[PDB]
């Protein structure tokens, strides 16, 4: 009929779209810098939008993409002040401690404020830091790339993050209480910027995350594909408490003018075993309630079998963590053994010299004291192998934002909108 | 009415949608500084475009604004009751994405055709 | 634009009760209501009456208020615009009167005068 085209401004059509987010946080200086980060806005909007059905995909997701680089340009803009131990890579005459031939006691001569003079200095590096020649050692990195000790005022805490779009942009969440990685959200309602996503680096334990309401959800891509991992989200918290029991001492090394190497001293009081704890009731009733799910997806009537790590890295074998700035990597083979007053017990190791992802190293400095951290283990990076067997993995660090970034898609606004009516304009 | 908010009626009907047009309206405007002023720059940068083209199509200030172009029914041969009071506005968006570059400069040239056709009224 | 497949041809006797089933398809089940129509060997067509999906809400004519048992399930989207529903017709006191051919019929618009109106319709089942 008597139809002209009208315009529009203002319309709710968005598309799926990338765009560069920008982090908020709330309340030292920690390494992931969110003292920079805008101040959090205490009132978050949340509008629902009604009869809105979004497809989502967490796993073609751009947000953990995004994240996972903020992180590793985190990382190394956190190091460029902090002094670089490149004269530590002498070599090192180590014995044992005195006491099973863990950690070691090394001295070795080395340069001092004053260019001409040396010192004949000593400190203690676990095993895992240095390796002989043919007793000589000499610290892991110095054949592969010279490390640069943290600032021993950083912080390793993770801080709750918030990512947020900019303008002409929205974040879209999805209040699907049973939804699995991918699909069509049928509940969808729009955020200024996400939750507080704790940047917790971890390995096939995730920690200190977000829980799952109603039962423990399990995801993956292709789950008929066995190069997939899949991460598995708990419901409820299963305890986890571990500690360094050694009571260790600092000691600062003038290695040059202001380049001050903090070295290990020496252990105070008893040798000890750093470990850590589960509730052998609590992983019990979490390990079947991750078994239930997991017939759904490989039948009611096959075995599930848990096993240990298949080998390779010391990163992705064990479950490595940070504990007040010490680096643990518990042995889980206590964890994962099973076929379907408590306490499970994990022996774990520390290291100082970490390479992380890549390239270059960082040497954590000791902490001094007694070291113990209470956290929650809320998810798993499991990996079948193909009578199915699943064990733990991670070789990838960006499936943990993944376990966090899964709720919400970057939509941009597109406000303009032609449609047909019965309007002209005068002349 | 009911303060449905930001995208509100999104999933509703067209001409749900139409009479909440001021909300998506208003919420339209160191190494990771540089980070944040690129998204504050292409902020202004996709404002500025919507106004531009709605600035060369005599809509400028006008939340709706009618022109003189009307609809070919290639377009959409939908009547206007199916779509005003059936399909929502990402519906009408994906049946209209082909001709939508059609359209804007018919808008484009019924605007330039229309202030020339002013200027030669008040030429005398 | 979607299919509204029904059940069988189920013929009970009087006094008993029949479950009819309105499977959906190529469309959002929840935005338009589901109307059950019925044209039997006796009269004509009669309305019976419509249920909202979306609002749950129940509209029947008063002479099958007391009979009918209507009820839905809930969408199970497939995309942004596509999802499957389920709507479900039962009877009380029946008779051989009430033997006749049964649908369901998806509304016509989402708002309006006319948001109700039955214009998508199923395949028919035969009654007793």
């Known amino acids: 009929e008597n139809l002209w085209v009208t315009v529009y401004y203002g319309v709710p059509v968005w598309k799926d779209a990338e765009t560069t987010l920008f982090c908020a946080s709330d309340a030292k200086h920690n390494v992931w810098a969110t003292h920079a980060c805008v101040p959090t806005d205490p009132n978050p909007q949340e509008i629902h939008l009604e009869n809105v059905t979004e497809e989502f995909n967490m796993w073609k997701n751009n947000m953990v993409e995004q994240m996972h680089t903020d992180i590793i340009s985190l990382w190394d803009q956190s190091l460029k002040p902090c002094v670089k131990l490149t004269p530590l890579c002498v070599t090192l005459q180590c014995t044992n401690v005195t006491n099973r031939g863990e950690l070691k006691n090394c001295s070795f001569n080395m340069t001092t404020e004053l260019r001409d003079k040396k010192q004949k200095v000593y400190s203690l590096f676990y095993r895992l830091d240095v390796v002989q020649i043919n007793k000589e050692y000499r610290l892991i990195n110095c054949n592969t790339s010279a490390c640069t000790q943290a600032c021993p005022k950083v912080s390793f805490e993770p801080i709750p993050i918030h990512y947020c779009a900019p303008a002409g942009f929205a974040i879209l969440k999805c209040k699907d209480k049973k939804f699995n990685g991918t699909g069509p959200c049928p509940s969808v309602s729009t955020v200024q910027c996400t939750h507080g996503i704790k940047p917790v680096v971890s390995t096939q334990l995730l920690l200190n995350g977000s829980l799952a309401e109603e039962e423990v959800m399990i995801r993956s891509e292709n789950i008929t594909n066995n190069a997939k991992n899949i991460l598995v989200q708990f419901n409820t918290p299963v305890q986890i408490n571990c500690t360094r029991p050694n009571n260790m001492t600092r000691k600062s090394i003038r290695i040059g003018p202001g380049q001050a190497f903090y070295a290990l001293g020496d252990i105070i009081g008893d040798i000890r075993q750093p470990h850590c704890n589960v509730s052998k009731a609590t992983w019990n009733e979490t390990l079947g309630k991750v078994v239930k799910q997991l017939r759904k997806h490989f039948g009611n009537n096959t075995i599930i079998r848990f096993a240990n790590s298949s080998g390779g890295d010391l990163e992705v074998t064990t479950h490595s963590f940070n504990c007040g700035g010490e680096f643990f990597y518990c042995n889980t083979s206590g964890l994962f053994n099973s076929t379907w007053n408590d306490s499970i017990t994990l022996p774990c190791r520390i290291k100082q010299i970490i390479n992380m992802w890549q390239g270059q190293c960082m040497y954590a400095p000791p902490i001094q004291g007694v070291i113990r951290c209470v956290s929650n283990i809320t998810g798993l990076i499991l990996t079948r192998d193909g009578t199915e067997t699943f064990r733990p993995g991670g070789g990838d660090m960006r499936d943990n934002w993944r376990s966090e970034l899964y709720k919400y898609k970057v939509v941009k606004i597109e406000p303009l909108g032609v449609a047909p009516t019965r309007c002209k304009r005068r002349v | 009415a009911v303060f449905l908010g930001f995208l509100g009626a999104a999933g509703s009907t067209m001409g749900a949608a139409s009479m909440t047009l001021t909300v998506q309206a208003r919420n339209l405007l160191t190494v990771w500084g540089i980070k944040q002023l690129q998204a504050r720059v292409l902020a202004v940068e996709r404002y500025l475009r919507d106004q531009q083209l709605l600035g060369i199509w005599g809509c400028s200030g006008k939340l709706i604004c009618c022109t003189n172009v009307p609809w070919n029914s290639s377009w959409s041969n939908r009547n206007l009751s199916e779509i005003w009071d059936n399909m929502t506005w990402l519906q009408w968006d994906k049946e209209i994405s082909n001709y939508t570059q059609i359209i804007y400069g018919l808008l484009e040239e019924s605007q330039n055709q229309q202030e020339k056709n002013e200027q030669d009224l008040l030429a005398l | 634009q979607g299919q509204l497949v029904q059940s069988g041809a189920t013929t009970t006797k009087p006094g008993s009760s029949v479950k009819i089933s309105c499977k959906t398809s190529g469309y959002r089940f929840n935005f338009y209501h589901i109307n059950w129509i019925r044209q039997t060997a006796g009269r004509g067509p009669e309305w019976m009456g419509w249920?909202?999906?979306?609002?749950?809400?129940?509209?029947?004519?008063?002479?099958?208020?007391?009979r009918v048992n209507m009820t839905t399930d809930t969408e199970v989207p497939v995309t942004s615009f596509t999802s499957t529903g389920a709507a479900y017709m039962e009877i009380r006191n029946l008779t051989s009167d009430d033997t006749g051919t049964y649908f369901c019929?998806?509304?016509?618009?989402?708002?309006?005068?006319?948001?109700?109106?039955?214009?998508?319709w199923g395949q028919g089942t035969l009654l007793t």
């Open positions: 249920i909202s999906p979306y609002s749950g809400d129940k509209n029947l004519a008063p002479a099958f208020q007391d």
């Open positions: 019929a998806k509304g016509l618009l989402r708002d309006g005068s006319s948001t109700w109106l039955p214009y998508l």
